[model samples]
Target chain A: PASFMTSICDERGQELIYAGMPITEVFKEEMGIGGVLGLLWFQKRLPKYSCQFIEMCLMVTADHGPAVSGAHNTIICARAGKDLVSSLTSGLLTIGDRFGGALDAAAKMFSKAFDSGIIPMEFVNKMKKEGKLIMGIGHRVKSINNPDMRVQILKDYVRQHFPATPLLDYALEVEKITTSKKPNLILNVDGLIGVAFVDMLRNCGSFTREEADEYIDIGALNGIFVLGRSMGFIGHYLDQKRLKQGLYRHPWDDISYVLPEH
Target chain B: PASFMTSICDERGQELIYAGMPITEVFKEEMGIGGVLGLLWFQKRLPKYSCQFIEMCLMVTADHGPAVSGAHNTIICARAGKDLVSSLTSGLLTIGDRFGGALDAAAKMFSKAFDSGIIPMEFVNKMKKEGKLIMGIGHRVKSINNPDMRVQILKDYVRQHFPATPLLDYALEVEKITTSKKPNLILNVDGLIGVAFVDMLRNCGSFTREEADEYIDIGALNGIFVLGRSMGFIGHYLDQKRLKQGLYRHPWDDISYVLP
Candidate 1:
């Protein structure tokens, strides 16, 4: 009649059941609890290094300050006296294909190129010939001279802990050729994390090749940015609320009023 | 065994049915094609003038431009490339106890004072003693010399159409005292619409006294503002999207960075 009741829960006399155990007991059954990161770790049966890597990824992408689009929208909503959930959702909704979403595209592109046996230079020349800028090749602020610390840390960790990093090595070769043309075209944080994650998923031995490709296809890479940046959005909301700021009114001079003449 | 099965709809030889009737017949039913506004009209069983008043109320409250917090947040979200629903929600969520939310409070306060047989001057004095600025009395921009045309239009319409307006009369008396103290403390848009709506619900003969008070308690007054302002929010979102506006970054000089 009811498509069979859920085993995940059922009513009892006094106690609430969750997944065949009491709610409180479920927490104690595992490693004390699980959030998004812990759940992902348990589901994938990831190694200790993989868990640490995921933690590092979250920490590094958490905030880019109020100058970014997401944080700016968050702060505006907060100052407008909206509640925390409203402000946070406003920030997250701003993330789309153009911003904070390049990581998944980068991962897929690198994995395909490496699997198809395309040479680094050949890939670069083909992308340039097609008049396309590589998804994660460059950064707006960081470059070879003043490298992004996040990218540097991710690269170093993968090199030290990953069993094999053939994709990362390949991506570095492409980076060398790109940076030769322009110093600021070095592999950015997105590029570094994308290639490094591909290495972990393929070589971790917990997943088959098909499983690894499936993860990329499902856009798991962008989820890292979404989850991490939520921390910053909440922080910005708290900052504005704590300051007790009034409504954010943009200055009239900043807007160009170009209404058509009747 | 299944507890119940829905007869609202099921694919039966490529025919569709809703509520035990063909979809085509439902539109011509008594309510006449239910939407948000249509449902309100049906629930109140409004006369022709009442329907016109509701439409006018919506038209007037739709947008206050980019300066107000709601439209400002919406435009910023739109510029940041958020979808229409997200932008609209961001705008709507900013409506709270302060901005664009005083209508319900104003209606309740006016109806209570009128029903209690409290004299206008005595009520004003009591509010003064309590040190509470009367809700919906003052305006940020409009004053006696430059009155709000929206309020003017609502007042004129109610006077012309309503059978009785005892609450509106009492509120006007209160307004006289408030403005005498300070010329700018006139009945603003929210104050005008609130008192007028109470008069409509109570005297229109469509609802009983308890039903009139129930509408006020349930915040049908503020619902008007929420629904009206949503129209403007969507307009501003489209404006930003069509202009191909980039992300909105506040000027550094405008913000005081006080974090330690």
Candidate 2:
């Protein structure tokens, strides 16, 4: 049972389909994402959220720009004889500021907007004016599209579950506003999934921004992503280990720092 | 001045010295590390030890392992065209659980020990009995004799300024007692430094563990470490960016699911 949990929930999303049923049906029916996550995590259903919002958060955060830790971990794993899972973990561990932490900051912004009852436009402008970022709104890589398919889940949920909610529409408007001027700006997955989670918390009656933050923290959503990425890292590490590749740790000799010649 | 501030402070201990004179000398002759840090961060040297103690907490937490956000940023920056300063900022972002978050947990344990006023032998024993690791005790890489370098600073400060104070001595005693049974388990830098900060807080009649924690959230000590490491990371990235050098993106190939 522990190994079963380890295999599925250990890294990224695990699909457990029976006959022809979609795996997500388990997320909605016998268990939600939260429940399935718990089953895969602890082999028991999570008492709250029946579905694994943590897994969703993890799935969302697991992949983003191939920079630093994730990128390095992946490359290193390729050299180290790791399978993809080990490689992913190495990379996931590296997703520190530029990737994973973005969600925490974004969640706070959405929580505030939801609690204050301000529409996304005023909120986004206020954030910009205050020199604060709107979290999951823009992407540096994709012109406007986050390549991850998991993002559609967030978009579909907002459309089907709460059409009246202001964030999704506000994000669309913000995207149009930014893209019209900047041509480079696009609504990324973080922005979409970020607003969706915010809406979920608001519907659950978490009125205070602080309270909403507790939901993100206690849920250990980031851990879920790291765990999933760990799978990828492990795989990469295995491949590298097999190849016995040496890391070209640094290439720049001129700019790199060195102690005094003495 | 902002860029200047960013450049000098971007290095871990460089902010302490500038223009061939110590920052403490420039600001005032009698200041300490905490006061100097407060000046660099808050731009004013605070009067109360409590406020300064919070700064100590921040410094204690500034850097951890190389795998942190700052570490990643350092790695990433090397790939881009940016210099060391930009790389450091990258490292700062990753200062959470997997890297620096352990400071919060370790600080919590120190607070518990400090508040109790009785170093519970039971706590260490219980951890040992369960084979559970205790935070702030020993290092994985450095052997026992390596002694947490952070503790030496606190001990030196206490010896010079407050020779009568029992804080450093008491902490050493506690660590010694704990490590006596397991000869290899020495009091590493985190434990001694943590206890010293807590002791200082207890002495001055202000500051709580919670407040110290909140200070860490804002202070750039750990953040700076991330940035410093980021310098290294950026170099690695530039080398690998064109070749997808460091990324192991695909992992689903070996993944299999058997539903029960």
Candidate 3:
């Protein structure tokens, strides 16, 4: 059909390129690659602490409860008799700006603000002036006094082990101002993970400044949350099976019988 | 890159073809098409009985226990921290020819042998002569007396409601001979579903002979089994989560310890 065709491989289909490196050559040296997280970080080897830190992120975000939008979507799809992939796909698709999805925005907003060198008060006031609801500051359930164990676990781990936590410290100051207004408006788990990951990616000695920027820009933090949440989602799928809960239905009372006004 | 191109849609990209019918036109008449199964059978409107029969098939094959390869793979992948799509995909990829697969072969083997017009004994001998494993004839656990409630449910439903079951009658005879040799070698759930489906496809009046053959040849029965088995795999993934089951591992004793 044409003089030549573009491809990931050669014309004879022997060589293939991945990220400008020969993919087969990379595979040939598989032993050097650490694990799943290491593979995700294929640009370079990560620090040992950073590797453990990534796993901790996954474990914390793994599952909160079945009541979450993504988990609820998965449960509904499972009961609706769709195949496993379809159910999971529908649930994952629910993760966008609102549902189980503020990680990317949190990182971008917090990290950009941190790098801009603005004081915490001016940053908060500017965002308020812009009419922006802080992306990962509040949670529907967990708050400052009645804490989230997940957030506590991550904070404890970072404070104890991370080489530095400058961005996290900055976010903590921001949280103080926000929570002073409303107790429930404290920096939540999503904010902590998002803002803290920027600190790790910048200070963990595994990535260059450009590499850190690329990871944040690519929503790498969100990927960690998604992978972890899948565990809880699958858990709910199985629990529904064990309960033999048939076709999920809501009561008519929950429905607002909307009709044209008389 | 080409002087011309082949496509499922027109150059304008407005007209699309699904199974050789104008796709948009079909979409306009969506109310007449039944549910998922009815859409799957785009060739014709399936009978009322057959639609109900299909749903029962899904429910029965939904979940047995999770010790199965597909469910185990899903659980392992979930615990290993893969994304949900990756976990489910690995489980589904496990279903081919050996694990939760064999529905297609079962239909082909039994239907082919049945249509040859030979007696059941001759058909059984010929399969034995060919050194074949009698695709869906035997089960790992269920036997002549031990029984599978899944098979029983399908059998009862078919007997009570079907206009006829010519293929099931033949398969039951084949089961008698196989079980006569070994009580454990009774017609299994896979075999029952596969062989019974051939009867339904031919006798259910929704499909012509060619349509029935096409569906079997295209592995339609296997699709049913896969869709049904996915429910169980997802269940297993979830169960492992609640149990806090960590990375699945086998202890040293279970390992053979072959130095060589």
C-alpha local distance difference test of each model: 0.78, 0.53, 0.71
Q: Candidate 1 regions off by >4 Å?
A: A1-42, A112-117, A125-131, A260-262, B1-42, B115-117
DockQ score of each predicted structure, in the order shown: 0.41, 0.05, 0.03
Error of 2 at B101 (Å): 10
DockQ value of candidate 3: 0.03
CAPRI-style class, candidate 3:
incorrect
What is the lDDT, from 0 to 100, of the residue B178 in candidate 1? 84
- lDDT string, candidate 3, B54-87, tens digits: 7887888887554454554565566555556656
Which of the two candidates, 2 or 3, achieves a greater DockQ against the reference? 2
Decide which is better by lDDT, 1 or 2. 1
TM-score for all predictions? 0.83, 0.44, 0.51
User: Residue-wise lDDT of candidate 1 within B40-149, one digit each (tens)?
Assistant: 33344456576667777888898888767678778877887778997888778777555687788788888788789999999999999999878778877777778999
How do the residues A1-262 of candidate 2 rate in per-residue lDDT, one tens digit apiece? 2222123432343654432234676546666556555555434334354244545555555444334467665876566544554355446656646756555556556656766877756776787799976676665555544443566665665566552556566667767766666654666666666666655544544235465466566643455556656555554555466767775443333233222121
Q: Which pairs in model 3 have colliding backbones?
A: A234-B238, A235-B238, A238-B235
Query: Compared with the true structure, what per-residue lDDT tens digits does model 2 show for residues B1-260?
Result: 12112212322344545323355564665556555544444444344453444444445444444454555556655555444434454555565556654444455565565456756576666566889776666666554456556666655654554314344455466567666766556656555554554455344433454654454446433443343344455545554455543524335545454433
Best by TM-score: 1
lDDT of 2 at B186: 62
